[PDB]
mmCIF file of C-alpha atoms in Angstrom:
data_model
loop_
_atom_site.group_PDB
_atom_site.id
_atom_site.type_symbol
_atom_site.label_atom_id
_atom_site.label_comp_id
_atom_site.label_asym_id
_atom_site.label_seq_id
_atom_site.Cartn_x
_atom_site.Cartn_y
_atom_site.Cartn_z
ATOM 1 C CA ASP G 1 25.013 4.880 10.239
ATOM 2 C CA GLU G 2 21.440 4.627 11.649
ATOM 3 C CA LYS G 3 19.729 1.288 10.962
ATOM 4 C CA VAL G 4 16.080 1.204 12.010
ATOM 5 C CA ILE G 5 13.728 -1.781 11.850
ATOM 6 C CA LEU G 6 10.310 -2.512 13.386
ATOM 7 C CA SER G 7 10.901 -6.210 13.185
ATOM 8 C CA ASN G 8 7.805 -7.168 15.235
ATOM 9 C CA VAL G 9 5.287 -5.750 12.822
ATOM 10 C CA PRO G 10 3.039 -8.825 12.264
ATOM 11 C CA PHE G 11 3.481 -10.757 9.001
ATOM 12 C CA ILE G 12 0.463 -11.622 6.800
ATOM 13 C CA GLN G 13 0.222 -12.998 3.239
ATOM 14 C CA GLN G 14 -2.665 -11.976 0.924
ATOM 15 C CA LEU G 15 -2.874 -15.467 -0.682
ATOM 16 C CA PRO G 16 -4.572 -17.733 -0.916
ATOM 17 C CA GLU G 17 -7.812 -15.823 0.042
ATOM 18 C CA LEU G 18 -7.208 -12.431 -1.655
ATOM 19 C CA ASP G 19 -5.775 -12.526 -5.189
ATOM 20 C CA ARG G 20 -5.824 -8.755 -5.148
ATOM 21 C CA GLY G 21 -5.415 -8.138 -1.440
ATOM 22 C CA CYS G 22 -2.010 -6.378 -1.165
ATOM 23 C CA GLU G 23 -3.460 -3.030 0.054
ATOM 24 C CA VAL G 24 -5.901 -4.425 2.606
ATOM 25 C CA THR G 25 -3.343 -7.016 3.768
ATOM 26 C CA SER G 26 -0.639 -4.316 4.377
ATOM 27 C CA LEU G 27 -3.263 -2.241 6.090
ATOM 28 C CA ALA G 28 -4.135 -5.261 8.280
ATOM 29 C CA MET G 29 -0.494 -5.643 9.444
ATOM 30 C CA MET G 30 -0.351 -1.888 10.234
ATOM 31 C CA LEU G 31 -3.648 -1.922 12.157
ATOM 32 C CA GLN G 32 -2.636 -5.046 14.171
ATOM 33 C CA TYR G 33 0.687 -3.462 15.183
ATOM 34 C CA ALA G 34 -1.241 -0.336 16.183
ATOM 35 C CA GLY G 35 -3.267 -2.502 18.603
ATOM 36 C CA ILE G 36 -6.425 -3.214 16.566
ATOM 37 C CA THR G 37 -7.929 -6.717 16.359
ATOM 38 C CA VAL G 38 -8.680 -7.087 12.648
ATOM 39 C CA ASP G 39 -7.920 -9.417 9.762
ATOM 40 C CA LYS G 40 -7.452 -8.980 6.023
ATOM 41 C CA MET G 41 -10.871 -10.556 5.183
ATOM 42 C CA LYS G 42 -12.816 -7.996 7.196
ATOM 43 C CA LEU G 43 -10.828 -5.186 5.585
ATOM 44 C CA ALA G 44 -11.382 -6.723 2.152
ATOM 45 C CA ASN G 45 -15.126 -6.589 2.678
ATOM 46 C CA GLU G 46 -15.047 -3.074 4.173
ATOM 47 C CA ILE G 47 -12.902 -1.262 1.648
ATOM 48 C CA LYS G 48 -15.028 0.994 -0.545
ATOM 49 C CA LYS G 49 -15.418 -0.561 -3.999
ATOM 50 C CA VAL G 50 -16.065 0.692 -7.529
ATOM 51 C CA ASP G 51 -16.988 -1.258 -10.631
ATOM 52 C CA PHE G 52 -14.109 -2.175 -12.983
ATOM 53 C CA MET G 53 -16.107 -0.803 -15.946
ATOM 54 C CA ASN G 54 -19.604 0.690 -16.003
ATOM 55 C CA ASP G 55 -21.427 2.610 -18.796
ATOM 56 C CA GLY G 56 -18.147 2.576 -20.747
ATOM 57 C CA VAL G 57 -16.288 4.313 -17.917
ATOM 58 C CA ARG G 58 -13.408 2.653 -15.914
ATOM 59 C CA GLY G 59 -13.360 2.753 -12.095
ATOM 60 C CA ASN G 60 -11.070 5.181 -10.314
ATOM 61 C CA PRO G 61 -8.783 3.702 -7.624
ATOM 62 C CA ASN G 62 -8.968 7.095 -5.945
ATOM 63 C CA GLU G 63 -12.689 6.445 -5.474
ATOM 64 C CA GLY G 64 -12.599 2.827 -4.279
ATOM 65 C CA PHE G 65 -11.051 -0.562 -4.845
ATOM 66 C CA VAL G 66 -11.485 -1.159 -8.602
ATOM 67 C CA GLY G 67 -13.098 -4.441 -9.468
ATOM 68 C CA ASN G 68 -12.534 -7.810 -7.831
ATOM 69 C CA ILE G 69 -10.435 -8.002 -4.671
ATOM 70 C CA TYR G 70 -10.948 -11.794 -4.300
ATOM 71 C CA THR G 71 -10.242 -13.520 -7.623
ATOM 72 C CA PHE G 72 -7.928 -13.081 -10.680
ATOM 73 C CA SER G 73 -10.690 -14.830 -12.601
ATOM 74 C CA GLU G 74 -12.523 -11.463 -12.699
ATOM 75 C CA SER G 75 -11.162 -8.048 -13.677
ATOM 76 C CA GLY G 76 -9.690 -5.814 -10.977
ATOM 77 C CA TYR G 77 -6.892 -3.466 -10.168
ATOM 78 C CA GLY G 78 -6.320 -2.068 -6.616
ATOM 79 C CA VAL G 79 -7.105 0.961 -4.504
ATOM 80 C CA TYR G 80 -5.163 4.153 -3.869
ATOM 81 C CA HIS G 81 -4.444 6.136 -0.725
ATOM 82 C CA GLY G 82 -7.790 8.037 -0.287
ATOM 83 C CA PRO G 83 -10.223 5.106 0.176
ATOM 84 C CA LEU G 84 -7.490 3.154 1.859
ATOM 85 C CA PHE G 85 -7.086 6.037 4.375
ATOM 86 C CA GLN G 86 -10.826 6.151 5.003
ATOM 87 C CA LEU G 87 -10.722 2.484 5.934
ATOM 88 C CA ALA G 88 -7.797 3.104 8.300
ATOM 89 C CA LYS G 89 -9.813 5.887 9.996
ATOM 90 C CA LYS G 90 -12.705 3.511 10.677
ATOM 91 C CA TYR G 91 -10.351 1.714 13.051
ATOM 92 C CA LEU G 92 -8.089 4.610 14.157
ATOM 93 C CA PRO G 93 -10.379 7.696 13.915
ATOM 94 C CA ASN G 94 -8.013 9.827 15.939
ATOM 95 C CA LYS G 95 -4.563 8.385 14.982
ATOM 96 C CA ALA G 96 -4.637 7.392 11.316
ATOM 97 C CA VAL G 97 -2.731 9.838 9.040
ATOM 98 C CA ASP G 98 -2.369 10.137 5.260
ATOM 99 C CA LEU G 99 1.223 10.992 4.477
ATOM 100 C CA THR G 100 0.638 11.058 0.714
ATOM 101 C CA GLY G 101 2.769 13.745 -1.005
ATOM 102 C CA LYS G 102 5.149 14.227 1.941
ATOM 103 C CA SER G 103 8.803 13.406 1.410
ATOM 104 C CA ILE G 104 10.460 10.023 1.890
ATOM 105 C CA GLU G 105 12.218 11.498 4.928
ATOM 106 C CA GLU G 106 8.909 12.019 6.670
ATOM 107 C CA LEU G 107 8.226 8.307 6.178
ATOM 108 C CA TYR G 108 11.560 7.368 7.729
ATOM 109 C CA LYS G 109 10.794 9.674 10.662
ATOM 110 C CA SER G 110 7.517 7.760 11.142
ATOM 111 C CA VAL G 111 9.351 4.440 11.149
ATOM 112 C CA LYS G 112 12.030 5.747 13.457
ATOM 113 C CA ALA G 113 9.271 7.060 15.756
ATOM 114 C CA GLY G 114 7.957 3.476 15.807
ATOM 115 C CA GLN G 115 5.072 3.692 13.304
ATOM 116 C CA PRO G 116 5.342 1.585 10.107
ATOM 117 C CA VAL G 117 3.920 2.979 6.864
ATOM 118 C CA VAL G 118 1.682 1.382 4.238
ATOM 119 C CA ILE G 119 2.923 2.388 0.771
ATOM 120 C CA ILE G 120 1.704 2.043 -2.805
ATOM 121 C CA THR G 121 4.569 1.263 -5.276
ATOM 122 C CA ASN G 122 5.200 -1.262 -8.054
ATOM 123 C CA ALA G 123 6.177 -4.932 -7.668
ATOM 124 C CA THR G 124 9.819 -4.334 -8.865
ATOM 125 C CA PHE G 125 10.495 -1.622 -6.312
ATOM 126 C CA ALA G 126 12.265 0.361 -9.047
ATOM 127 C CA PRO G 127 11.116 3.126 -11.383
ATOM 128 C CA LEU G 128 9.246 1.879 -14.408
ATOM 129 C CA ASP G 129 9.640 2.933 -17.968
ATOM 130 C CA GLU G 130 6.827 5.229 -19.037
ATOM 131 C CA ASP G 131 5.471 2.716 -21.537
ATOM 132 C CA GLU G 132 4.613 0.351 -18.665
ATOM 133 C CA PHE G 133 1.720 2.742 -17.658
ATOM 134 C CA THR G 134 -1.785 3.135 -19.065
ATOM 135 C CA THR G 135 -4.082 6.087 -18.628
ATOM 136 C CA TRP G 136 -7.656 5.265 -17.719
ATOM 137 C CA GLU G 137 -10.462 7.713 -18.197
ATOM 138 C CA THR G 138 -12.799 7.679 -15.207
ATOM 139 C CA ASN G 139 -15.710 9.863 -14.055
ATOM 140 C CA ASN G 140 -13.098 11.875 -12.173
ATOM 141 C CA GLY G 141 -10.319 12.479 -14.628
ATOM 142 C CA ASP G 142 -7.404 10.458 -15.933
ATOM 143 C CA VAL G 143 -5.436 8.171 -13.749
ATOM 144 C CA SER G 144 -2.154 6.430 -14.428
ATOM 145 C CA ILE G 145 -2.184 2.706 -13.713
ATOM 146 C CA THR G 146 0.278 -0.127 -14.118
ATOM 147 C CA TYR G 147 -0.544 -3.818 -13.630
ATOM 148 C CA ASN G 148 2.699 -3.912 -11.685
ATOM 149 C CA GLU G 149 0.920 -1.899 -8.899
ATOM 150 C CA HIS G 150 1.777 -3.243 -5.481
ATOM 151 C CA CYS G 151 1.416 -2.352 -1.789
ATOM 152 C CA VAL G 152 3.720 -3.151 1.105
ATOM 153 C CA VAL G 153 4.495 -2.037 4.673
ATOM 154 C CA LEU G 154 7.654 -0.015 5.232
ATOM 155 C CA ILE G 155 9.084 -1.281 8.449
ATOM 156 C CA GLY G 156 12.723 -0.214 8.372
ATOM 157 C CA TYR G 157 15.728 1.344 6.620
ATOM 158 C CA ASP G 158 19.505 1.559 6.539
ATOM 159 C CA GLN G 159 21.949 3.538 4.399
ATOM 160 C CA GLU G 160 21.720 1.166 1.481
ATOM 161 C CA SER G 161 18.336 -0.583 2.003
ATOM 162 C CA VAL G 162 14.709 -0.375 3.048
ATOM 163 C CA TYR G 163 13.024 -3.243 4.863
ATOM 164 C CA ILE G 164 9.432 -4.224 4.096
ATOM 165 C CA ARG G 165 6.550 -6.604 4.758
ATOM 166 C CA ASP G 166 5.371 -7.760 1.332
ATOM 167 C CA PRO G 167 1.969 -9.568 1.379
ATOM 168 C CA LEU G 168 3.058 -11.511 -1.728
ATOM 169 C CA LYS G 169 6.465 -12.689 -0.452
ATOM 170 C CA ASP G 170 6.691 -15.500 2.060
ATOM 171 C CA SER G 171 9.384 -14.021 4.317
ATOM 172 C CA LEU G 172 10.084 -11.830 7.351
ATOM 173 C CA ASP G 173 13.253 -10.715 5.694
ATOM 174 C CA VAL G 174 12.776 -8.592 2.637
ATOM 175 C CA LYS G 175 15.134 -5.761 1.839
ATOM 176 C CA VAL G 176 15.434 -3.849 -1.353
ATOM 177 C CA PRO G 177 17.831 -1.174 -2.680
ATOM 178 C CA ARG G 178 16.794 2.064 -1.039
ATOM 179 C CA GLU G 179 17.263 4.581 -3.825
ATOM 180 C CA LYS G 180 15.341 2.683 -6.503
ATOM 181 C CA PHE G 181 12.641 1.999 -3.887
ATOM 182 C CA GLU G 182 12.195 5.675 -3.176
ATOM 183 C CA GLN G 183 12.022 6.568 -6.862
ATOM 184 C CA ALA G 184 9.438 3.870 -7.580
ATOM 185 C CA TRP G 185 7.379 5.192 -4.575
ATOM 186 C CA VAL G 186 7.541 8.798 -5.814
ATOM 187 C CA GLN G 187 6.655 7.585 -9.331
ATOM 188 C CA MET G 188 3.438 5.949 -8.052
ATOM 189 C CA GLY G 189 2.340 9.226 -6.481
ATOM 190 C CA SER G 190 4.164 9.268 -3.139
ATOM 191 C CA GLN G 191 1.116 7.478 -1.651
ATOM 192 C CA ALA G 192 1.434 6.501 2.042
ATOM 193 C CA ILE G 193 -0.727 5.823 5.080
ATOM 194 C CA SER G 194 0.359 5.541 8.710
ATOM 195 C CA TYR G 195 -0.827 6.499 12.172
ATOM 196 C CA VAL G 196 0.478 8.444 15.176
ATOM 197 C CA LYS G 197 1.113 7.248 18.774
ATOM 198 C CA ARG G 198 -1.345 9.621 20.475
ATOM 199 C CA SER G 199 -4.888 10.854 19.649
ATOM 200 C CA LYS G 200 -5.139 14.055 17.590
#
């Protein structure tokens, strides 16, 4: 059975500099492999941001990174696919693609075609019980959040596993049970960013 892995996708850790840098750090690995000179600190400054709480309203991770990307000592959450995609486009205006809502199989096609995929999921890589989520009210409707939110680069798959770069795990070798992985991914909104080989 077909085992695919993009084992030369660069490896970066969010810590120590970015307590909440999993999205920008995964994005950095993706951009580097695509040929862009960039580091996680530049991306951390460039990502669109929204206040954690303002005028009694919580920030929407669909609008920007919510709160403090740098330090756990201040409130913060993360950022979802929209703003994260806009940042990718700054660097790949003609190749960056938002695969959010497509099927897992599309993502595997991307990887097999040689393009790794940044994905939003949760830190356990398995579906979470409903009571693990909160609903925040924002200026743009309700959003489901979990403080388990995490972001990694999909770099490979086999029949039983997927293979990732996890900006919080100090290792080139991270595989997790495929099925649970996919269900966790779908549960967080099927959010995914990649790019294509040639300009569009």
